[PDB]
Amino acid sequence: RFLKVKNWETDVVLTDTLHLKSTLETGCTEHICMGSIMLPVRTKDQLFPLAKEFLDQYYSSIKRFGSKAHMDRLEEVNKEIESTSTYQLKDTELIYGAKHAWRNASRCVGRIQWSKLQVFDARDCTTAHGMFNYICNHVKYATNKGNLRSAITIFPQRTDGKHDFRVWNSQLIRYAGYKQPDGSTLGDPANVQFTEICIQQGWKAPRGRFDVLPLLLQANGNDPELFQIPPELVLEVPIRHPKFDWFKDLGLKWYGLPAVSNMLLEIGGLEFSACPFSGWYMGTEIGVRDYCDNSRYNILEEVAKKMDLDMRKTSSLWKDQALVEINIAVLYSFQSDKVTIVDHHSATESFIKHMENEYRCRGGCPADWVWIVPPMSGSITPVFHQEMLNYRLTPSFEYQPDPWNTHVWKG
Amino acid sequence: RFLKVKNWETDVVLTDTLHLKSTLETGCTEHICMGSIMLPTKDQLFPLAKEFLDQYYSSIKRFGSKAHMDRLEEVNKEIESTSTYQLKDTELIYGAKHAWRNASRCVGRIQWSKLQVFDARDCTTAHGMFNYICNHVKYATNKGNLRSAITIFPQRTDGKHDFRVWNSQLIRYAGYKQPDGSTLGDPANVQFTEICIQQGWKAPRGRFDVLPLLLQANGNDPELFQIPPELVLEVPIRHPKFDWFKDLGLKWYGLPAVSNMLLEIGGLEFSACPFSGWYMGTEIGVRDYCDNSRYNILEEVAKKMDLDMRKTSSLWKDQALVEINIAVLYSFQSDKVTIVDHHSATESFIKHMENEYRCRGGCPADWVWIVPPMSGSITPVFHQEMLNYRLTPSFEYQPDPWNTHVW
Ligand code: HEM
Ligand code: HEM
Ligand SMILES: Cc1cc(N)nc(CCc2cccc([C@@H](N)Cc3cc(C)cc(N)n3)c2)c1
Ligand SMILES: Cc1cc(N)nc(CCc2cccc([C@@H](N)Cc3cc(C)cc(N)n3)c2)c1
Ligand SMILES: C[C@H](O)[C@H](O)[C@H]1CNc2nc(N)[nH]c(=O)c2N1
Ligand SMILES: C[C@H](O)[C@H](O)[C@H]1CNc2nc(N)[nH]c(=O)c2N1
Ligand SMILES: [Zn+2]
């Protein structure tokens, strides 16, 4: 079957056949759409089909489908599953798998970049100390003094579910949040619970507005351990505004490297529970969400005060006006310091070109509109007007529950 | 089967049970979400009538009463005899208000219960339709203090005698393609304008020409009528800080009035049912003015602001966008024509959602349409999970009649 998507601005129509390869479920049915719902130990049993399907894809991509090398590899994996109950990916397969999980990430606007991903194989890692070292090297390589390079580091896969490698931080680099006795929050309100765990584990909290959190690292199902990332490895950008000289005195800064560390990477039925990956920011992630969400740094009021906007009625659009100024400041600041960043116009335009290319060469591009459309200036970006089909392909990145909810403490 | 929706800003979790009463299909499956696609006989009719009357008599606390049973009986007899049936006035009013109540893409639903329903089921000609519509327009406009209304023409019979308003809204501006190659006026309305000209309309060929109505009665060929100019309230667009803004020559009309949809109540189909409320500012300022395929004015405004248009990263588009939207709200407010800003509308919808969950066990909502086309995440709807499902009575899209009309 064929499915059509139309762009309502250009009348361009595309035809999806890739959705036919989708196995995993969406959350939706014929009677309910769950498109705005944020969150909608395997047996050999299910494992060999998952392995086979993955290896068929891999061998197709390298133009060796049905070869002796292909057949031998299936055989080899089959026997390994039957006798050890799991199997090991070749380096080539791991790299291909990691690239494809990104390619398949329907909520990711940055996918034009998917084929340039540095894959760091950390499957020989055995301890939390070992994890720390790997992660420092990733941060340094990815940061590259401001000329950011995409990377992922892949720690050993799940075995029985009792020996998981996990990075407890949601992102490698994030600022602490402290709930005060008066109910106010100092620093990032999003990281309060994790900061408390760090403190509980013995972190000495400086208790400022922008304190880089320590890494909390679990190897082999053991209790996690604290490590401070070397500060000289943590590139940060002080935020200033090209015309508003008082903007610097708000005291804002952000880190340059966005690096997700709480997701689970699935390749050929294998589960990599610790697989931190990083790219570079789109300005709105910081300027719209991080700074302006009510539940985050929430700076809109202070910014609009300083601009002396009429704040007595929402219909003056003071929030909107201040929102634009903050986002200009972020882009200006990253640019002035030569730290890679992309604005939402350029990013969404690139995504549209990527998506059209994917339809032509691959037969589709699963995309989640709710996430792809930026959180400001929606309809002046080309993605707003683009129909999108959301479905789940493997390899994939999956959400997993926070480790402090599931971890069996050894003490 | 019982479903939670969470607000990620406030942590409020609501439980939806109303979706279980959903009847129509979504476009989605277990394998594919189509959340972003714009357009995804006697036997069938008695179930539809029963379902409706059951909810009606339930709503007036008379479920299972003799009056309930008697009406089921009466409607039942009428269908078997006549292959259709007629709504009581009370049922028509209830049905219309609920179609709006169930409109998952409408942010304005806190208002659903205050809808003036004009029963035009006695209308027989296109001249009658025209009279009904001017009365609706005058009533709704109310000298700028807008009031929600719907006018309901006779229901579908055998499908060859449909009442249809050919216009997509009661009030729209004409569009004309130039020898120049560009477009004068509203590019969205070019095809319809051609049909008007080809039906006989003498076009002024200006930038802001209110289109005539093209009214179809009883399946007959449609006819042209101009809405009295004095009933079409328009607003010149100025900016409270930029003196030059008015020089752009922009205006918009006060009355948003959708005329192309199909109202379905208890199996019955009202193919002509123009309805109207008042604008949310972004509809005009963001979509009408700034869509590339619409009036597309961002470039011109940004130049008058003398912004650095060299690189997308100066955010010149976003800057001019906010300003155009400030001008829309200011101009409507100054002329005392009802308008709502996206902040206030989305706040009211969150309150409405809470009421509906509390009072009805849910509220179907389409996040893709509810979240405003600018400043998404600074409105509370952005952080609000929504379940989208189809309830009846309902407003449905229907195909442009010129594609269907045999002359
Ligand atoms: C190259 C620069 C990149 C840019 C500009 C980019 C852009 C984005 C943005 C704006 C989001 C939404 C994030 C949010 O709203 O919090 C996102 C989500 C995502 N991105 Fe990308 N991205 C990039 C690289 C990557 C890389 C290298 C990977 C993995 C290898 C990746 C995988 C994802 C995944 C899995 C999500 C969804 C996250 C979630 O559900 O929380 N991204 N990206
Ligand atoms: C009271 C003032 C009202 C406001 C501020 C309001 C707000 C809106 C907005 C912003 C949209 C999105 C439309 C678009 O983006 O083009 C919408 C869609 C809708 N509204 Fe409301 N509305 C109001 C009154 C009504 C009334 C009185 C009805 C019916 C009686 C109604 C039924 C609908 C329907 C069916 C849609 C979707 C239209 C479509 O799918 O094309 N609206 N409304
Ligand atoms: C409940 C829940 C579920 C879910 N799936 N995600 C969340 C939080 C979403 C989130 C929060 C912070 C950073 C990012 C990165 N996606 C931010 C990021 C990462 C990369 C690699 C590049 C880039 N430009 N940006 C995503 C919450
Ligand atoms: C293909 C297609 C499908 C579909 N369902 N809708 C469209 C056009 C969408 C549209 C266009 C103009 C006006 C409105 C009114 N919905 C605008 C409106 C109406 C009312 C009553 C109040 C208000 N504030 N605003 C909606 C196209
Ligand atoms: C409830 C809703 O799905 C939630 O607020 C989503 C909406 N769209 C998003 N889009 C992006 N890119 N990131 C997000 O965190 C969200 N949050
Ligand atoms: C492709 C996408 O469905 C389309 O652009 C939608 C997105 N959201 C919308 N939301 C509203 N309110 N109105 C619209 O016309 C649209 N257009
Ligand atoms: Zn869906």
> For the domain A236-258+281-346, what is the CATH code?
3.90.1230.10
Three-state SS letters, chain A: CCEEEEECCCCCEEEECHHHHCCECCCCCCCCECCCCCCCCCCHHHHHHHHHHHHHHHHHHCCCCCCHHHHHHHHHHHHHHHHHCCCCCCHHHHHHHHHHHHHCCCCCCCHHHCCCCEEEECCCCCCHHHHHHHHHHHHHHHHHHHCCCCEEEECCCCCCCCCCCEECCCECCCECEEECCCCCEEECHHHHHHHHHHHHCCCCCCCCCCCECCEEEECCCCCCEEECCCHHHCCEEECCCCCCHHHHHHCCEEECCCEECCCEEEECCEEECCCCEECCEEHHHHHHHHHHCCCCCCCHHHHHHHCCCCCCCHHHCHHHHHHHHHHHHHHHHHHHCCCCEECHHHHHHHHHHHHHHHHHHHCCCCCCHHHHCCCCCHHHCHHHHECCCECECCCEEECCCCHHHHCCCCC
Handedness of CA B151, B154, B159, B165 (dihedral sign): negative
B135 in Cβ contact with B185 (< 8 Å): no
CA distance B328 to chain A (A): 10
**Ligand 3 geometric centre to CA of A107 (Å):** 9
A134 is in an annotated binding site: no
CA distance B404 to B407: 10
Which sequence spans correspond to the domains of chain B? 16-121+148-158+262-276+346-370, 122-147+162-233+397-401, 234-256+279-344
Q: What is the DSSP letter of B321?
A: H
What are the chain B neighbours of A330 within 8 Å (beta carbons)?
none
Helix (H, G, I), strand (E, B), or coil: what is residue B378? Answer: helix
Decide if B166 is catalytic: no
Radius of gyration of chain B from its Cα atoms, rounded to whole angstroms: 23
Domain range A124-149+164-235+399-403, CATH architecture = Alpha-Beta Complex (3.90)
- Per-residue buried b or exposed e for A95-115, using 16+ beta carbons within 10 Å of the residue's own CB: bbbbbbbbbbbbebbbbbbbe
Residue of A nearest to B340 (CA): A315
DSSP-assigned beta bridge partners for residue A107: none
The verdict on the CB of residue B95 being under 6 Å from ligand 2 is no
| End-to-end C-alpha distance for chain A, whole angstroms | 55
Q: What are the residue ranges of helices labelled H in B11-125?
A: 42-59, 66-82, 89-101
- Per-residue buried b or exposed e for A315-334, using 16+ beta carbons within 10 Å of the residue's own CB: bbbbbbbbbbbbbbbbbbbb
Residue identifier of the C-alpha nearest atom 13 of ligand 3? A260
Helix (H, G, I), strand (E, B), or coil: what is residue B406? Answer: coil
Q: Cβ neighbours of residue A372 under 8 Å, at least 6 residues apart? A: A107, A109, A348, A351, A383, A388
Decide if B278 is catalytic: yes
The verdict on the CB of residue B369 being under 6 Å from ligand 6 is yes
Q: What value, to the nearest 5°, has the Cα angle with vertex B384 and ends B24 and B316?
A: 110
Both tokens assigned to B387: 């379940």
Both tokens assigned to A366: 């699963």
CA distance B53 to B45: 12
B325 in Cβ contact with B285 (< 8 Å): yes
CA distance A191 to A212: 11
B36 in Cβ contact with B367 (< 8 Å): no
Among B30, B286, B321, the residue with its CB nearest the CB of A26 is B30
Sheet with A277-278, edge to edge strand ranges: A118-121, A151-154, A277-278, A259-260
Q: Cβ neighbours of residue A360 under 8 Å, at least 6 residues apart? A: none
Q: After which residues is chain B broken (C to N over 2.5 A)?
A: 40
Q: Please compute, for residue A395, the number of CA atoms within 13 A of its CA located in the half-sphere on the CB side.
A: 27
CA distance B232 to B255: 8
B248 in Cβ contact with B237 (< 8 Å): yes
Among A317, A328, A368, the residue with its CB nearest the CB of B315 is A328
The experimental technique used to determine this model is X-ray
**Ligand 6 geometric centre to CA of B318 (Å):** 19
CA distance A210 to B340: 38
Contacts for A94-98: CB closer than 8 Å, 24+ residues apart: A94/A119, A94/A121, A94/A123, A94/A154, A94/A267, A95/A119, A96/A58, A96/A61, A97/A54, A97/A58, A97/A265, A97/A267, A97/A268, A97/A395, A98/A152, A98/A154, A98/A265, A98/A267, A98/A275, A98/A395
Q: Hey, do B16-121+148-158+262-276+346-370 and B234-256+279-344 end up sharing a CATH topology, with the first three levels equal?
A: no
The verdict on the CB of residue B34 being under 6 Å from ligand 6 is no
Say how many C-beta atoms besides its own lie within 10 A of residue A67's C-beta: 12
Contacts for A88-91: CB closer than 8 Å, 24+ residues apart: A88/A123, A89/A267, A89/A268, A89/A270, A91/A121
Interface A-B, measured as beta-carbon pairs within 8 A, has a size of: 201
Which residue out of A37, A95, A108, A346 has the highest number of ligand 1 atoms within 8 Å of its CB and is therefore the one to mutate? A108
| CA distances for A369 relative to A109, A374, A396, angstroms | 10, 9, 18
A141 in Cβ contact with A197 (< 8 Å): no
Resolution (A): 2.0
Both tokens assigned to A369: 């509109």
CA distance A358 to chain B (A): 18
**Ligand 3 geometric centre to CA of B31 (Å):** 24
Q: After which residues is chain A broken (C to N over 2.5 A)?
A: 40
Given the residues B223, B283, B323, B356, select the one marked as catalytic. Answer: B283
Say how many C-beta atoms besides its own lie within 10 A of residue B106's C-beta: 18
CA distance A326 to B319: 12
DSSP-assigned beta bridge partners for residue B118: B151
Domain range B16-121+148-158+262-276+346-370, CATH architecture = Alpha-Beta Complex (3.90)
**A220 closest CA partner among A149, A305, A129:** A129
Fold that domain B234-256+279-344 belongs to in CATH: 3.90.1230
Angle, helices A44-61 vs A91-103, to 10°: value is: 90
**A381 closest CA partner among B342, B211, B312:** B312
Q: What value, to the nearest 5°, has the Cα angle with vertex B376 and ends B374 and B378?
A: 115
B26 in Cβ contact with B388 (< 8 Å): yes
What are the chain A neighbours of B314 within 8 Å (beta carbons)?
328
Active site residues of A: 108, 111, 280, 285
Q: Looking at domain B122-147+162-233+397-401, what is its CATH homologous superfamily?
A: Nitric Oxide Synthase;Heme Domain;Chain A domain 2 (3.90.440.10)
CB contact under 8 A, B9 and A295: yes
Both tokens assigned to A61: 């991509």
Domain A16-123+150-160+264-278+348-372 falls under CATH 3.90.340.10: yes
Angle, helices B42-59 vs B89-101, to 10°: value is: 90
Residue B357, amino acid = Y
What are the chain B neighbours of A369 within 8 Å (beta carbons)?
35-36, 368
**A142 closest CA partner among A335, A277, A232:** A277
Among B22, B292, B343, the residue with its CB nearest the CB of A32 is B22
Give the phi and the psi of residue B358 in degrees, each rounded to 5. Answer: -65, -40
Which helix H or strand E contains B289, and what residues bound it? helix B289-290
